Design an enzyme around this catalytic site. Structure first.
Site, PDB file in Angstrom:
ATOM      1  N   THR A  11      43.664  62.899  26.537  1.00  0.00           N
ATOM      2  CA  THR A  11      44.326  64.191  26.650  1.00  0.00           C
ATOM      3  C   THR A  11      45.382  64.125  27.736  1.00  0.00           C
ATOM      4  O   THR A  11      45.405  63.160  28.533  1.00  0.00           O
ATOM      5  CB  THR A  11      43.354  65.306  27.004  1.00  0.00           C
ATOM      6  OG1 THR A  11      42.714  65.018  28.233  1.00  0.00           O
ATOM      7  CG2 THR A  11      42.270  65.523  25.952  1.00  0.00           C
ATOM      8  N   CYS A  38      55.584  44.395  20.722  1.00  0.00           N
ATOM      9  CA  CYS A  38      55.110  43.013  20.679  1.00  0.00           C
ATOM     10  C   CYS A  38      54.894  42.499  22.070  1.00  0.00           C
ATOM     11  O   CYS A  38      55.790  42.082  22.720  1.00  0.00           O
ATOM     12  CB  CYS A  38      56.095  42.164  19.892  1.00  0.00           C
ATOM     13  SG  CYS A  38      55.379  40.506  19.580  1.00  0.00           S
ATOM     14  N   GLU A  93      40.878  66.692  18.914  1.00  0.00           N
ATOM     15  CA  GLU A  93      42.231  67.198  19.109  1.00  0.00           C
ATOM     16  C   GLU A  93      42.255  68.723  18.922  1.00  0.00           C
ATOM     17  O   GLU A  93      41.789  69.246  17.915  1.00  0.00           O
ATOM     18  CB  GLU A  93      43.213  66.517  18.168  1.00  0.00           C
ATOM     19  CG  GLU A  93      44.571  67.164  18.075  1.00  0.00           C
ATOM     20  CD  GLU A  93      45.286  67.315  19.399  1.00  0.00           C
ATOM     21  OE1 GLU A  93      45.337  66.315  20.179  1.00  0.00           O
ATOM     22  OE2 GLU A  93      45.786  68.431  19.650  1.00  0.00           O
ATOM     23  N   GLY A 143      52.698  59.144  33.323  1.00  0.00           N
ATOM     24  CA  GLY A 143      51.356  58.716  32.971  1.00  0.00           C
ATOM     25  C   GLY A 143      50.300  59.589  33.660  1.00  0.00           C
ATOM     26  O   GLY A 143      49.530  60.291  33.012  1.00  0.00           O
ATOM     27  N   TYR A 172      46.368  70.288  29.072  1.00  0.00           N
ATOM     28  CA  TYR A 172      44.910  70.221  28.946  1.00  0.00           C
ATOM     29  C   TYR A 172      44.295  71.589  28.707  1.00  0.00           C
ATOM     30  O   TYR A 172      44.355  72.452  29.556  1.00  0.00           O
ATOM     31  CB  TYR A 172      44.265  69.551  30.144  1.00  0.00           C
ATOM     32  CG  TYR A 172      42.792  69.245  29.914  1.00  0.00           C
ATOM     33  CD1 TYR A 172      42.384  67.968  29.531  1.00  0.00           C
ATOM     34  CD2 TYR A 172      41.833  70.209  30.087  1.00  0.00           C
ATOM     35  CE1 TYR A 172      41.071  67.675  29.292  1.00  0.00           C
ATOM     36  CE2 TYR A 172      40.490  69.956  29.858  1.00  0.00           C
ATOM     37  CZ  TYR A 172      40.108  68.691  29.474  1.00  0.00           C
ATOM     38  OH  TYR A 172      38.792  68.455  29.264  1.00  0.00           O
ATOM     39  N   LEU A 173      43.758  71.753  27.505  1.00  0.00           N
ATOM     40  CA  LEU A 173      43.228  73.033  27.076  1.00  0.00           C
ATOM     41  C   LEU A 173      41.871  73.354  27.718  1.00  0.00           C
ATOM     42  O   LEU A 173      40.918  72.637  27.511  1.00  0.00           O
ATOM     43  CB  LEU A 173      43.087  73.053  25.565  1.00  0.00           C
ATOM     44  CG  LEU A 173      42.682  74.416  24.963  1.00  0.00           C
ATOM     45  CD1 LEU A 173      43.713  75.471  25.226  1.00  0.00           C
ATOM     46  CD2 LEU A 173      42.494  74.226  23.475  1.00  0.00           C
TER      47      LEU A 173
HETATM   48  N1  LIG Z   1      47.311  54.451  29.042  1.00  0.00           N
HETATM   49  C1  LIG Z   1      48.572  54.372  28.704  1.00  0.00           C
HETATM   50  O1  LIG Z   1      49.130  53.121  28.505  1.00  0.00           O
HETATM   51  C2  LIG Z   1      49.424  55.599  28.538  1.00  0.00           C
HETATM   52  C3  LIG Z   1      50.727  55.477  28.035  1.00  0.00           C
HETATM   53  C4  LIG Z   1      51.436  56.639  27.794  1.00  0.00           C
HETATM   54  C5  LIG Z   1      50.913  57.863  28.151  1.00  0.00           C
HETATM   55  N2  LIG Z   1      49.656  57.966  28.706  1.00  0.00           N
HETATM   56  C6  LIG Z   1      49.028  59.253  28.981  1.00  0.00           C
HETATM   57  O2  LIG Z   1      48.250  59.592  27.842  1.00  0.00           O
HETATM   58  C7  LIG Z   1      48.075  61.034  27.869  1.00  0.00           C
HETATM   59  C8  LIG Z   1      48.429  61.624  26.509  1.00  0.00           C
HETATM   60  O3  LIG Z   1      49.809  61.359  26.158  1.00  0.00           O
HETATM   61  P1  LIG Z   1      50.418  61.990  24.812  1.00  0.00           P
HETATM   62  O4  LIG Z   1      51.821  61.533  24.611  1.00  0.00           O
HETATM   63  O5  LIG Z   1      49.478  61.856  23.690  1.00  0.00           O
HETATM   64  O6  LIG Z   1      50.477  63.531  25.319  1.00  0.00           O
HETATM   65  P2  LIG Z   1      50.757  64.856  24.502  1.00  0.00           P
HETATM   66  O7  LIG Z   1      51.021  65.937  25.565  1.00  0.00           O
HETATM   67  O8  LIG Z   1      51.786  64.654  23.475  1.00  0.00           O
HETATM   68  O9  LIG Z   1      49.360  65.151  23.772  1.00  0.00           O
HETATM   69  C9  LIG Z   1      48.217  65.472  24.499  1.00  0.00           C
HETATM   70  C10 LIG Z   1      47.221  65.992  23.422  1.00  0.00           C
HETATM   71  O10 LIG Z   1      46.002  66.335  24.046  1.00  0.00           O
HETATM   72  C11 LIG Z   1      45.503  67.511  23.380  1.00  0.00           C
HETATM   73  N3  LIG Z   1      44.513  68.144  24.225  1.00  0.00           N
HETATM   74  C12 LIG Z   1      44.744  68.716  25.460  1.00  0.00           C
HETATM   75  N4  LIG Z   1      43.596  69.200  25.889  1.00  0.00           N
HETATM   76  C13 LIG Z   1      42.616  68.919  25.002  1.00  0.00           C
HETATM   77  C14 LIG Z   1      41.276  69.172  25.008  1.00  0.00           C
HETATM   78  N5  LIG Z   1      40.702  69.826  26.010  1.00  0.00           N
HETATM   79  N6  LIG Z   1      40.527  68.765  23.920  1.00  0.00           N
HETATM   80  C15 LIG Z   1      41.145  68.133  22.847  1.00  0.00           C
HETATM   81  N7  LIG Z   1      42.491  67.866  22.843  1.00  0.00           N
HETATM   82  C16 LIG Z   1      43.200  68.275  23.935  1.00  0.00           C
HETATM   83  C17 LIG Z   1      46.729  68.339  23.034  1.00  0.00           C
HETATM   84  O11 LIG Z   1      46.420  69.252  21.993  1.00  0.00           O
HETATM   85  C18 LIG Z   1      47.734  67.248  22.715  1.00  0.00           C
HETATM   86  O12 LIG Z   1      47.876  66.991  21.325  1.00  0.00           O
HETATM   87  C19 LIG Z   1      48.991  61.546  28.977  1.00  0.00           C
HETATM   88  O13 LIG Z   1      48.233  61.791  30.146  1.00  0.00           O
HETATM   89  C20 LIG Z   1      49.971  60.415  29.210  1.00  0.00           C
HETATM   90  O14 LIG Z   1      50.552  60.495  30.480  1.00  0.00           O
HETATM   91  C21 LIG Z   1      48.898  56.846  28.827  1.00  0.00           C
END
Ligand SMILES: NC(=O)c1ccc[n+]([C@@H]2O[C@H](COP(=O)([O-])OP(=O)(O)OC[C@H]3O[C@@H](n4cnc5c(N)ncnc54)[C@H](O)[C@@H]3O)[C@@H](O)[C@H]2O)c1
Ligand SMILES: NC(=O)c1ccc[n+]([C@@H]2O[C@H](COP(=O)([O-])OP(=O)(O)OC[C@H]3O[C@@H](n4cnc5c(N)ncnc54)[C@H](O)[C@@H]3O)[C@@H](O)[C@H]2O)c1
Lengths: 550, 550
Positions: free
Chosen positions: B261, B407, B193, B489, B270-271
């Site tokens: 991420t 749930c 993170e 997403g 995305y950093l």
């Molecule tokens: N699979 C699923 O069921 C599902 C459900 C909800 C959301 N998502 C997806 O999951 C992803 C994350 O959602 P979220 O709410 O945690 O987003 P968020 O924007 O709150 O957090 C993303 C995190 O990624 C970190 N990050 C970015 N680049 C990074 C890097 N290069 N190295 C390390 N850390 C890095 C940021 O610091 C941040 O804390 C999104 O793409 C979202 O759309 C997936």
């Protein structure tokens, strides 16, 4: 499964096959969409607009008819790209049918992917009113085309157009309305069409007046009729991508130039220069990628000719078939130097919720429509433009399939008319229920940056929240069937839009639904234009007491 | 504009601000979305998932609250990309709010155009549950992440993950569920993170156990805890695009590899390697195009490392942030050589309508949720996996904002649960009404070819008629609010999806709505997967007596 040698027409009179008028109605209108007198190619389920179909294939058709026939008063059928996929419990004040056709996740929203899905039996193009069962032949578009030519006349020529002429192409189901529309607006017209059978269809339905024998003959006719102030439409058999460039070359100057070929679908809707329709259809199955490139290359030449006319001072506009986009992709960088008809001409009407409002008499009786025409005149006694429309319609528009009427009205009068029609069904003045709908081209039901939302004043052209909200609201209010389609008019990738139809069966329950839905449906379009900042819309919102929180 | 230094939380207890519980519910859930303990950055209206917001801006927030507070029992509010645009008359059995967020006509459905619109004040990214007011902190996803790790463990390791570890990244709102989900599945985890504050939030909410001081130290802790068979989650402050390639270089072998991420939004989520979050946030304003490129370039490196782990035989999968797509666009042609989590692991649950079903206690009372947990165990007496889920949730999931429960249950059981909860409100067992909802990730509510509909057996991945029909059906059946969103997403261009929430206020009218809505909603997902030809879905449809005409 895609070809059936049968003539289909809507059941007539007051005997029901389905359990209620609310399910009989979509059953009748689906059949009406495929009437030999209505549809372009109904043996292949094709209604209009390229490959705009009524059901996905014949097995699906049969199953939709069977399902509507048994559907209960608290059940709702889901149609998914022309396939009856599920029936679920709702309530009597919800729509009986919910339809979603041709929707593709945006990155995949193109003809290439649609056609891959179609080859797997997973796709159907709904156009606008094809897959949502509210097509009424060429009449559905003819007032909109008339109003476009009329407004262009007001802008460029002092109103009427006597002594002027329009040059365009496309005499398909919807392009076929262009010649009559020009005539009603007072113009002569030259309408180029590559299929003789399509010219014949237009001649037989009184939509085009005559056919020239060649370009020279067409020009002698145009010169003569315009000189004499006659308003007569001429068809010319040929290819617009060859004729328009030739006219530019001869220095011919029309008074307006547009186009309504099926440019929105290069594979199916647009004949490349030098090809026969037969070669085009045969090669589309064998080498589709080459056909698309040929068609778009011809569109480019066609559009440069339209651009060349405009450079000579000729009012030129895009009539909603995406042809500029196709030319642009083929290297015509300035294809959008001429505007779409909606920003140029029609948007002010949409700002008051005015659009292609229509109704059909399920009885099958011409006199039912004549009685509605008389009632519209009684309810809107002080609009002579509209009285004139209904007189012109009675004189010049022949019914196709079930008698129906196009009548452009907006927020306020839609509900007044619908409630009055419902009272006429109740009293027995009308022989059977009527259905009230519209095209999906309407003020609150479509997002389309190359057509209905082109050059919005606030830059919001591509925002498609609005049509989605419109369908959701029509469902919450009690339209009888509600539709969400993708790519109508302008093709895959370029549009999202909604449909609604509501049944006036004379009942108090119908009346309560009508009052709501026919307020809300145009209401969303006044809202959408008020949001964009149009003062005419904001004014209309205030007049009509809309509650727009922002 | 977008920043206000205020702390917002849902009102508690039984006193209404709004006119009824049907309008009090969305009012409370909107505020709960912004609770300091729930949301990632609520002073900027951001809930989760990059710039997933609850309302477009603060002026819009204020007006939504104002409007909800006065909305009548037969009125419906339209919310258009987080803006309250119109109020229209419907009826008490329709939804009180209809929401459409982030929808763009497909050819314009990309971040570049969304950002143009955002600059003009015309846009808001809804994610899934951010703009539709049903986010319950990290709990919303945690069961899904757990089920994913469990199923991967079943496929690759004989089930339990004892002595194994997961390597992943992203400890945002949803990614923060990863550590705890891995722990619950029996695995240790290393979670990378880039923001210390996000690590802190996960520690504060007890979603992660400890933070390592550096990479060497992280690996010491993983080595120790796996050897001892403990299941401990480790956060490591750093950049995945740097650390994953380094671990590959060192020959470190995790037992599974994924990522969460916010890769779906290259500008904001995305950093790039070597940058700080503060550099990233500033330069996104100055040079967005260069920032996007730098982000995508790092995603390519990151994905290549993922691919390199997979080549070493490590189970690797995409956990739904579109990172493969971004890498592919940057030249990683085999980015899709590892699968998404839904086709790999979760699709069988969706075939029975099982998904992230959830509810929240509007009272604010933890004991309301505990009472629901006991009721679920009573109504589903013979599913130990589910009882164990609820035990783990009680033991290891701390509430954020309004007490809520995730749930996972499917077609049949959802309605049974909802009617029982409605009974408990009526009886006074529960202190106030509850709301039932879900993520938009669910069987019948989403089309997303790089996530929920990846690799559909019939090739129908991109067909998006289904979520649209789900929203229309939820509207017809009487959900309290219904939503249609784009790009949740996976980002602009890559998904379309629906949301629903229904209020259980203990009334008979609520009961009639619940019975059909909570049937129909998972019903559409079973329908959708039966249509695709999944035998488990066809079987479920038969068992549950769905009416599927084809
Ligand atoms: N699979 C699923 O069921 C599902 C459900 C909800 C959301 N998502 C997806 O999951 C992803 C994350 O959602 P979220 O709410 O945690 O987003 P968020 O924007 O709150 O957090 C993303 C995190 O990624 C970190 N990050 C970015 N680049 C990074 C890097 N290069 N190295 C390390 N850390 C890095 C940021 O610091 C941040 O804390 C999104 O793409 C979202 O759309 C997936
Ligand atoms: N602007 C509007 O309000 C509106 C409304 C409905 C439809 N449309 C659009 O109008 C277009 C026409 O619709 P339609 O129902 O008439 O379609 P159609 O497919 O029924 O007919 C198209 C006609 O174009 C002809 N054609 C194709 N290539 C030609 C060429 N190179 N030269 C001469 N003729 C050629 C075909 O022979 C055919 O008769 C479509 O793009 C449709 O989406 C616009």
């Amino acid at each position: 499964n895609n070809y059936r040698d049968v003539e289909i027409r809507a059941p007539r009179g007051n005997k029901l096959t389905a359990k209620s008028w609310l399910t009989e109605a979509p059953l009748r209108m689906l059949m009406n969409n495929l009437d030999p007198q209505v549809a372009e190619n109904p043996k292949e389920l094709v209604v209009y607009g390229g490959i705009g179909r009524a059901a996905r294939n014949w097995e699906c058709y049969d199953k939709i008819v069977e399902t509507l026939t048994r559907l209960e008063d608290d059940e709702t059928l889901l149609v998914q790209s022309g396939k009856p996929v599920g029936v679920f419990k709702t309530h009597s004040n919800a729509p009986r049918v919910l339809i979603a056709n041709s929707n593709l996740v945006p990155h995949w929203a193109n003809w290439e992917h649609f056609n891959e899905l179609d080859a797997k039996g997973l796709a159907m193009y709904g156009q606008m009113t094809a897959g949502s069962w509210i097509y009424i032949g060429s009449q559905g578009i003819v007032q909109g085309t008339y109003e476009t030519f009329v407004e262009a006349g007001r802008q460029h020529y002092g109103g009427s157009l006597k002594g002027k002429w329009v040059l365009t192409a496309g005499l398909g189901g919807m392009g076929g309305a262009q010649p009559l529309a020009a005539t009603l607006a007072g113009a002569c017209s030259l309408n180029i069409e590559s299929q003789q059978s399509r010219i014949d269809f237009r001649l037989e339905t009184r939509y085009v007046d005559e056919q020239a024998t060649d370009l020279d003959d067409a020009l002698v006719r145009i010169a003569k009729y315009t000189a004499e102030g006659k308003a007569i439409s001429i068809a010319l058999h040929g290819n617009a991508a060859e004729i328009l460039p030739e006219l530019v070359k001869r220095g011919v100057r029309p008074d307006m130039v547009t186009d309504q070929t099926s440019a929105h679908d290069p594979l199916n809707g647009y004949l490349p220069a030098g090809w026969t329709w037969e070669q085009y259809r045969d090669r589309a199955q064998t080498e589709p990628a080459a056909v698309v490139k040929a068609a778009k290359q011809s569109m480019a030449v066609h559009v440069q000719a339209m651009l060349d006319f405009q450079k000579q001072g000729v009012p030129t506009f895009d009539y909603g078939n995406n042809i500029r986009q196709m030319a642009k992709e083929e290297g015509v960088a300035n294809a959008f130097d001429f505007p779409g008809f909606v920003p140029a001409y029609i948007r002010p009407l949409f700002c008051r919720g005015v659009g292609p409002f229509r109704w059909a008499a399920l009885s099958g009786e011409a006199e039912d429509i004549y009685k509605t025409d008389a009632k519209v005149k009684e309810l809107i006694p002080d609009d002579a433009h509209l009285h004139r429309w209904l007189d012109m319609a009675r004189e010049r528009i022949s019914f196709q399939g079930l008698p129906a009427r196009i009548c452009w009205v907006g927020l306020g009068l839609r509900a007044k008319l619908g409630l009055a029609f419902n009272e006429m069904v109740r009293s027995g003045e009308l022989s059977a229920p009527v259905v009230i709908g519209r095209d999906h081209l309407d003020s609150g039901s479509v997002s389309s940056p190359n057509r209905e939302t082109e050059a919005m004043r606030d830059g919001s052209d591509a925002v498609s929240d609005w049509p989605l909200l419109n369908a959701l609201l029509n469902t919450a209010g009690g339209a009888t069937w509600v539709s969400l389609h993708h790519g109508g008019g302008v093709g895959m990738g370029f549009s999202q839009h909604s449909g609604m139809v509501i049944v006036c069966d004379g009942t108090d329950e119908a009346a309560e639904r009508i009052a709501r839905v026919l307020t809300n449906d145009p209401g969303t379009g006044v809202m959408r234009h008020a949001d964009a900042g149009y003062d005419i819309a904001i004014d209309c919102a205030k007049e009509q007491g809309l509650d727009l929180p922002m």
